[PDB]
């Protein structure tokens, strides 16, 4: 098919190429450490009041959100700014946690665009909020048989409270025109009140611990990323790899070179990666493409016989899946090695040639010719006594065919626009 002829002559012809494909495509990544302190926010035994809600900054740690997903205690779990299914892989700069204790019926108004006592006077949440709100029942902890009276919230206040603002001052409210100046008279009330938490109260009156998480993105580089997984190592095989974002395809083997402690990979020749430090075991692994090469067919001509031999150039010959012989130019199959040496019939390479036994194909080392030693002496000569005349033929080419090609008739073909 390649020669476009039904009969072929004796020789070697290159037909096609072959490759080895990857099978595993492993991925490595460093160890998952320095988890964010989610425990001291949710499992803390102390919680702040409504008007004096705590604020905590969390940065430069991996945030594992699976513990919140699999928790079987949260009553509400709503995210208002991001897709909550993608929290495990998204990365943000900084996050904040706000914790307080509010009445059960007051958890409804912890949301953008909602109005209420806590929404306007204690905790205001902006309409462009990007985060999640978490709350759960904590009646067994914040309520006592005698009634708890420690938590406070603001109910008298002159002006609405802007988002992410806190008012700790507890000065008396000026409901009346006259200045109260701290007296406990009429139109002068304490701007805070306490919750009457009791174990026998209804569901809407029981205390509820609320944790609010906020996500922000700035021009600073992102620090709070999500956890990432990794696979196992495979060696001595053609395999894709991904080492800390460095992708490629090759065979991973052991290496003897010693990297500097801060160095990661090597670009010794032509800016090509060939050695990569393992992020987990801190070991250096060599990288080499698995295999590629051409395929050649050795035949003695279809006139003589239909037997053929296949040669793969530059192949270790252990990935090719008959006689198999390893040659310096790659192994060949279908040929029988012999101890004998003859003249070169079909060249193969590196001093190896193939021929037909006349009924099998054999491979042998080249013979330069017959070896003889001339009888040399300091008083001996050889003089011919006869002669023969011979005629030899020599052929040299002198010229070729004269051709001429026109542009407009070839490139365009009598087209006006093309011209």
């Amino acid at each position, epitope marked *: 098919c390649t020669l476009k002829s039904f009969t072929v002559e004796k020789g070697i012809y290159q037909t096609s190429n072959f490759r080895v494909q990857p099978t595993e495509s492993i991925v490595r990544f460093p160890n998952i450490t320095n988890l964010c302190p989610f425990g001291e926010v949710f499992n803390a035994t102390r919680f702040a009041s409504v008007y004096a809600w705590n604020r905590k900054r969390i940065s430069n740690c991996v945030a594992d959100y699976s513990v919140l*997903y*699999n*928790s*079987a*205690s*949260f*009553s*509400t*779990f*709503k995210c208002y700014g991001v897709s*909550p*299914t993608k929290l495990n892989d998204l990365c943000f700069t900084n996050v904040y946690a706000d914790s307080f204790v509010i009445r059960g019926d007051e*958890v*409804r108004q912890i*949301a953008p665009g*909602q109005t209420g006592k806590i929404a306007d006077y204690n905790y205001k949440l902006p309409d462009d909020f990007t985060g999640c709100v978490i709350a*759960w*029942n904590s009646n067994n902890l914040d309520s006592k048989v005698g009634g708890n009276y420690n938590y406070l919230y603001r109910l008298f206040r002159k002006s609405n409270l802007k988002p992410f603002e806190r008012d700790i001052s507890t000065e008396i409210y000026q409901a009346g025109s006259t200045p109260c100046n701290g007296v406990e008279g009429f139109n002068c009330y304490f701007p805070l009140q306490s919750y009457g938490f009791q174990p026998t109260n209804g*569901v809407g009156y029981q205390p509820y611990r609320v944790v609010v998480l906020s996500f922000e993105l700035l021009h600073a580089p992102a620090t709070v990323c999500g956890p990432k997984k990794s696979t196992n190592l495979v060696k001595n095989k053609c395999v894709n790899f991904n080492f800390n974002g460095l992708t490629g395809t090759g065979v991973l083997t052991e290496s003897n070179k010693k990297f500097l402690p801060f160095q990661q990979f090597g670009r010794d020749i032509a800016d090509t990666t060939d050695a990569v430090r393992d992020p987990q075991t801190l070991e250096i692994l060599d990288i080499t493409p698995c295999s590629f090469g051409g395929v050649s067919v050795i035949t003695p001509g279809t006139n003589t016989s239909n037997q053929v031999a296949v040669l793969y150039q530059g192949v270790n010959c252990t990935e090719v899946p008959s006689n198999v012989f390893q040659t310096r130019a790659g192994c060949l199959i279908g040929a029988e090695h012999v101890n004998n040496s003859y003249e070169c019939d079909i060249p193969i390479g590196a001093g190896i040639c193939a021929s037909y036994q006349t009924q099998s194909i054999i491979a042998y080392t080249m013979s330069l010719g017959a070896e003889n030693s001339v009888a040399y002496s300091n008083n001996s000569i050889a003089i011919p006594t006869n002669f023969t005349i011979s005629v030899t033929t020599e052929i040299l080419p002198v010229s070729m065919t004269k051709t001429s090609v026109d542009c407009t008739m070839y490139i365009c073909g009598d087209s006006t626009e093309c011209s």
Partner: single-chain antibody
Amino acid sequence: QVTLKESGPTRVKPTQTLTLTCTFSGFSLSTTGVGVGWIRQPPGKALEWLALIYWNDDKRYSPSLKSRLTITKDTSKNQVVLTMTNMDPVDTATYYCARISGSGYFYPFDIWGQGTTVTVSSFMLTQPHSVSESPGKTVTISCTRSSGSIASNYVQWYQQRPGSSPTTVIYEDNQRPSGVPDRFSGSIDSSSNSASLTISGLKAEDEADYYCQSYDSSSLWVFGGGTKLTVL
């Protein structure tokens, strides 16, 4: 395509205890967050959730029927076994086994099984019963919450054509699963404590029963009363 096979006995007696087995193909229970559940549907009365098994060793049961329910998993040949005792004639219904992949607050039952009929022998959700609408003009169906706020947890919607398992049409209150028509939409009325499913234009055929659900740690999966929709 992932499919589930469920089979078991049909005849049952008040003094006998039955067992159900749902065999799943196309996916493995060992995958992360994957889970298999059992949901029963009475013929004329609304369906309800019974039990669930996750990829790890944890079981969920209906609070009102926790004593009579027990679910066992077997990853050796990809099946789960549900057993129920204390046979009582009102139990007769159609049983489904469905798959859920995630935490529970968010992911609805995406894949449902085939109807298996068992017959005997010898925090609520409110939803309007039925609505009638002429074709062309839009129509909405409400789903209100008795206790708490409807904005506290996500709401998912289903449609169930007769002779077929229910299929998700709205999840996470704004998203649309792939393949559903664009005319389906949803919204939440936070003031009136209700969620509404909106069909923008009756330009196609829709003969199915619509249900709403939500999730809570105290109450687990709970289904609404259902709405019967017909074309005038």
